[PDB]
Design an enzyme around this catalytic site. Structure first.
Site, PDB file in Angstrom:
ATOM      1  N   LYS A   1      -5.169  30.816  37.293  1.00 47.98           N
ATOM      2  CA  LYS A   1      -5.710  31.857  36.414  1.00 47.98           C
ATOM      3  C   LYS A   1      -5.007  32.008  35.059  1.00 47.98           C
ATOM      4  CE  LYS A   1      -3.541  35.435  39.263  1.00 47.98           C
ATOM      5  NZ  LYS A   1      -2.270  35.654  38.514  1.00 47.98           N
TER       6      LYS A   1
ATOM      7  N   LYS B   1      -4.296  22.618  41.449  1.00 51.43           N
ATOM      8  CA  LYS B   1      -4.884  23.894  41.848  1.00 51.43           C
ATOM      9  C   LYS B   1      -5.381  24.695  40.636  1.00 51.43           C
ATOM     10  CE  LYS B   1      -2.554  27.683  42.691  1.00 51.43           C
ATOM     11  NZ  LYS B   1      -3.278  28.963  42.525  1.00 51.43           N
TER      12      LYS B   1
ATOM     13  N   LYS C   1       6.948  27.378  39.167  1.00 51.11           N
ATOM     14  CA  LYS C   1       7.002  28.403  38.123  1.00 51.11           C
ATOM     15  C   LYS C   1       8.228  28.247  37.216  1.00 51.11           C
ATOM     16  CE  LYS C   1       3.682  31.735  39.751  1.00 51.11           C
TER      17      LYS C   1
HETATM   18  N1  LIG Z   1      -6.973  27.975  43.280  1.00 47.53           N
HETATM   19  C1  LIG Z   1      -6.991  28.821  44.338  1.00 47.53           C
HETATM   20  N2  LIG Z   1      -7.776  28.616  45.428  1.00 47.53           N
HETATM   21  C2  LIG Z   1      -7.784  29.473  46.477  1.00 47.53           C
HETATM   22  N3  LIG Z   1      -7.010  30.580  46.530  1.00 47.53           N
HETATM   23  C3  LIG Z   1      -6.185  30.889  45.506  1.00 47.53           C
HETATM   24  C4  LIG Z   1      -6.122  30.015  44.332  1.00 47.53           C
HETATM   25  N4  LIG Z   1      -5.228  30.551  43.489  1.00 47.53           N
HETATM   26  C5  LIG Z   1      -4.750  31.678  44.074  1.00 47.53           C
HETATM   27  N5  LIG Z   1      -5.319  31.862  45.277  1.00 47.53           N
HETATM   28  C6  LIG Z   1      -5.087  32.996  46.186  1.00 47.53           C
HETATM   29  O1  LIG Z   1      -5.516  34.170  45.491  1.00 47.53           O
HETATM   30  C7  LIG Z   1      -4.747  35.293  45.917  1.00 47.53           C
HETATM   31  C8  LIG Z   1      -4.183  36.006  44.697  1.00 47.53           C
HETATM   32  O2  LIG Z   1      -3.425  35.074  43.925  1.00 47.53           O
HETATM   33  P1  LIG Z   1      -2.055  35.557  43.243  1.00 47.53           P
HETATM   34  O3  LIG Z   1      -1.514  34.450  42.373  1.00 47.53           O
HETATM   35  O4  LIG Z   1      -2.268  36.935  42.667  1.00 47.53           O
HETATM   36  O5  LIG Z   1      -1.222  35.631  44.635  1.00 47.53           O
HETATM   37  C9  LIG Z   1       0.188  35.911  44.714  1.00 47.53           C
HETATM   38  O6  LIG Z   1       0.898  35.655  43.755  1.00 47.53           O
HETATM   39  C10 LIG Z   1       0.723  36.562  45.950  1.00 47.53           C
HETATM   40  N6  LIG Z   1       2.139  36.317  46.066  1.00 47.53           N
HETATM   41  C11 LIG Z   1       0.444  38.044  45.792  1.00 47.53           C
HETATM   42  C12 LIG Z   1       1.049  38.858  46.900  1.00 47.53           C
HETATM   43  C13 LIG Z   1       2.142  39.696  46.770  1.00 47.53           C
HETATM   44  N7  LIG Z   1       2.439  40.296  47.947  1.00 47.53           N
HETATM   45  C14 LIG Z   1       1.580  39.918  48.910  1.00 47.53           C
HETATM   46  C15 LIG Z   1       1.448  40.212  50.253  1.00 47.53           C
HETATM   47  C16 LIG Z   1       0.429  39.615  51.006  1.00 47.53           C
HETATM   48  C17 LIG Z   1      -0.461  38.711  50.420  1.00 47.53           C
HETATM   49  C18 LIG Z   1      -0.364  38.371  49.065  1.00 47.53           C
HETATM   50  C19 LIG Z   1       0.641  38.958  48.312  1.00 47.53           C
HETATM   51  C20 LIG Z   1      -3.674  34.733  46.849  1.00 47.53           C
HETATM   52  O7  LIG Z   1      -4.057  34.990  48.193  1.00 47.53           O
HETATM   53  C21 LIG Z   1      -3.645  33.238  46.582  1.00 47.53           C
HETATM   54  O8  LIG Z   1      -3.294  32.471  47.742  1.00 47.53           O
END
Ligand SMILES: Nc1ncnc2c1ncn2[C@@H]1O[C@H](COP(=O)(O)OC(=O)[C@@H](N)Cc2c[nH]c3ccccc23)[C@@H](O)[C@H]1O
Ligand SMILES: O=c1[nH]c2cc(Cl)ccc2o1
Lengths: 325, 333
Positions: free
Chosen positions: B197, B194, B112
């Protein structure tokens, strides 16, 4: 009235320098400004320490500030952790603070992230209360500058959400130097405890510490003010003047033909005479559990009312969906 | 009482098929088996600079999208992170039991930082500490996430163990729940990267709220390989694109990789892409249909947020009180 914010560390045992310097100065300006005293327990935990001693030291600090004359009816005095908005604003301001700004603070892999990140929390502590003035020592000037930069940066993006705080420039003017090292200022953090007089020391301890205080080899011994050549005797005069309100020339006349034994004797009596009224108030407040609980509750309530108004404006600016109350 | 599930997703960008397969699909299926708590992490989102109107709209979009996916406010606690002050409070406290080196080594911070060079902020650095607070507040046993969050999850376990060792059984040590398939959905024109979004190139991404017609076109243009003859076989190193398409088809339909490989025996990438596009188009059509019913019902979204924050606060306040008592703070009156 301008808003003044001070952070009070729950660990330092206050010296006569702290009292006759900054604290006595501020006690007499409680009607001039809206003064806020925040006992910074969230800052304290950046240094690992005993849990029970932290709880005790929070209460020791509250009682001592009250004993020194901070008035809960004029000023706001509270425990930092009792007001969630500190942590909340701290997270938000983390996102408008450059990583570079924190790494450039004059202070690798094994320090805790709290020690690295606390200048952001400090900025949040100040900006929460629309603070106008912050009294800072030399060591806190960088931190104040960061809070000003963060405030201006956020304001430039979102409108006039924060007041840009200013340093409180005028200094108390009471000089209190270390007893065995009169060139160095008396500081709570000193390792040599014989350099300082703590506010809770009994008359026996004060006599002992003042008796050991460095003077000079002038022959005959002469009680005259001269920081360059007579640092020790000058410090003793400054301490005595600070306590009694007598001028240096007046004290120089008072000790005509007198030795350093007589000076020290009067310094110890003067200092102990000041500490006995202070210690009476402290022990009375410190052991009134209901009084301390009420001060803390009232203080947190006043603080939160102000803090929540700022945080709401910040949250609305950032664009968070408002909580459903 | 049931074991506790917690997970979150940022209201930044438009959630993708990646976010669904790695996380949201598992979230929906865990709802009866465990006590599930799902969070819209708006405080994490602002570590990347957001337009204020975009952030507010994306928070509500994300909420409606959880509901459209099958997250049921009668079964699960659904809430917005910033509505519960205890996240930030515990986050600060856990900063003091986290080492600088644990944060500087994080892949997400590094990636990032490179991507947002003009805004390498302290929130982005401190990201994992707030995330650990999110999890540990709810006495969490299982955390359903994608592969990309593995490192962050591991730190939250270390923090929990470290804190517990000094103070007693204050936190549960959480476990990751990463699915076998669909844990790391890849970009359609760059299958070694990967699926993100917030990708600059939209053609890399299948968005959940994206027009199905647009998505079908993207699947047909997805890069495959030069194998002669073309063969539909799962192989990440040699056949990244074909493998990603198989991974996507499996996760939508439920069929295994061997089952899909058998189905495509004697077939080429036309059949593979036709099936992927059909399965994904059907899923997104149905999803988007439920989404608009939720998304335009502001009274329902307001109530879900209200009830969820209430339920969340009850758990969070309990944990924070214990943390504060252990570390030695004077308890609030
Ligand atoms: N290309 C992909 N293939 C498969 N899985 C993916 C892909 N891109 C994203 N993910 C998963 O989607 C969830 C949400 O993504 P975020 O970027 O919001 O995901 C995040 O930025 C986290 N830090 C948000 C968060 C904050 N606090 C937490 C506590 C527990 C669990 C999660 C969180 C995530 O599970 C991420 O692993
Ligand atoms: O995780 C975190 N880091 C934080 C830093 C500040 Cl200043 C406040 C809250 C936090 O929560």
């Amino acid at each position: 009235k301008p808003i003044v914010f001070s952070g009070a560390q729950p660990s330092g045992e206050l010296t006569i320098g702290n009292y006759m310097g900054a604290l006595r100065q501020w006690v007499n300006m409680q009607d001039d400004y809206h003064c806020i005293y925040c006992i910074v327990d969230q800052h304290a935990i950046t240094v690992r320490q005993d849990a029970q001693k932290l709880r005790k030291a929070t209460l020791d600090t509250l009682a001592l500030y009250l004993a020194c004359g901070i008035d809960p009816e004029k000023s706001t005095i509270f425990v930092q952790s009792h007001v969630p908005e500190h942590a909340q604003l701290g997270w938000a301001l983390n996102c408008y603070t450059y990583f570079g700004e924190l790494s450039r603070m004059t202070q690798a892999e094994n320090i805790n992230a709290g020690l690295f990140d606390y200048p952001v929390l400090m900025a949040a502590d100040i900006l929460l209360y629309q603070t106008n003035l912050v009294p800072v020592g030399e060591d806190q000037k960088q931190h104040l500058e960061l809070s000003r930069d963060i405030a201006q940066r956020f304001n430039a993006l979102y409108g006039e959400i924060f007041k840009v705080p200013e340093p409180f420039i005028p200094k108390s003017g009471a000089r209190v130097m270390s007893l065995l090292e009169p060139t160095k200022k008396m500081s709570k953090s000193d390792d040599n405890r014989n350099n300082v007089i703590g506010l809770l020391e009994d008359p026996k301890s004060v006599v002992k510490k003042i008796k050991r205080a460095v003077t000079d080899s002038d022959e005959p011994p002469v009680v005259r003010y001269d920081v360059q050549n007579k640092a020790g005797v000058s410090n003793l005069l400054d301490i005595l003047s600070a306590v009694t309100g007598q001028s240096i020339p007046e004290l120089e006349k008072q000790f005509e033909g007198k030795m350093y034994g007589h000076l020290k004797g009067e310094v110890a009596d003067a200092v102990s005479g000041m500490l006995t009224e202070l210690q009476e108030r402290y022990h009375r407040f410190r052991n009134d559990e209901a009084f301390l609980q009420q001060v803390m509750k009232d203080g947190a309530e006043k603080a939160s009312a102000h803090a929540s108004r700022t945080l709401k404006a910040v949250y609305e600016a950032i664009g968070f969906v408002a909580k459903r109350h």
